[PDB]
């Protein structure tokens, strides 16, 4: 109990020395003109820039395209909407940036596994 | 039943990794690149020293623990200023790479700040000891 509090204060003071002077740099960037991301302008996930969210959506898009060429469904028009839906589901289910990214790559890996097995990625 | 990180850790090492795209450990280079290519992630402030934790799969599965849960507990206990990255659950081994995210951006000749800074090697060792002893991944303390 006392050791836990001592460690907490000690760790906070140690990691404050690595912040030091000018601890401002927030500079949140609002989304660009044509961000294809549901709930683009949000701050639910700290330290998650909009560009990283777009990057994760883009990775989901390549995963969906690979699944398409490995399944041969109707067309790729719905791929973009499906990728946005999956990205929004990942964003909702995640709370911080790194675990959100990990969930994104887990979804990509699941899509790749479905493509290897030959089955389309269901909702 | 109390379960700290030690009960689910196969091993733990501290490396000097100045360049995450270099990744002196060869096995992780496949899945570390997909983490440092994100626009929000920059190698400018990542700290060179890296704490690599290899998790025992049998002990992890006996408790139905996921690397997602371990990372969530790390974020809760140590804040969002300690970078944590982990592999895929289907990989051959469970790897957890942790770095001390130094939020300073200037770093211009410092300000003679070497008084109690504790260069990240020994600080990472202390963080590792705290993570292995007082992390409470699962269960209630005083129950074994």
Numbering used by the authors:
A (entry chain U): 498 to 620
B (entry chain A): 1162 to 1305
Quoted from the paper:
RECQL5 is a regulator of transcription elongation known to interact directly with Pol II, thereby playing important roles in suppressing genome instability. In this study, we solved several cryo-EM structures of Pol II ECs complexed with RECQL5 in different nucleotide-binding states of the helicase. The RECQL5 IRI module, encompassing the αN helix and KIX domain, wraps around the surface of the RPB1 lower jaw with exquisite molecular complementarity, serving as an anchor point of RECQL5 on Pol II. Meanwhile, the helicase domain binds to the RPB1 upper jaw and downstream DNA.
Purified and mildly crosslinked EC bound to RECQL5 (catalytically inactive D157A mutant and without addition of ATP, ECREC-Apo) was deposited on graphene oxide grids and subjected to cryo-EM imaging. We focused first on the IRI module interactions. To improve the resolution in this region, we reprocessed this dataset, classifying in the IRI module region instead of the helicase domain. This approach greatly improved the map’s local resolution at the IRI–Pol II interface, enabling us to trace the polypeptide chain. Several residues in α3 (N595, K598, and R610) participate in hydrogen bonding or ionic interactions with residues in RPB1. Additionally, residues in the top half of α3 (V593, L596, L602) and in α1 (K548, H552) mediate nonpolar interactions with RPB1. R544, which is situated in a loop between α1 and α2, forms salt bridges with D1241 and D1242 in RPB1. Our structure further shows that the αN helix binds to a shallow nonpolar groove in the top face of the RPB1 lower jaw. Several residues (W504, Y508, M512, and R515) stick into this groove to interact with RPB1, while two others (F507 and Q511) interact with residues in the wall of the groove.
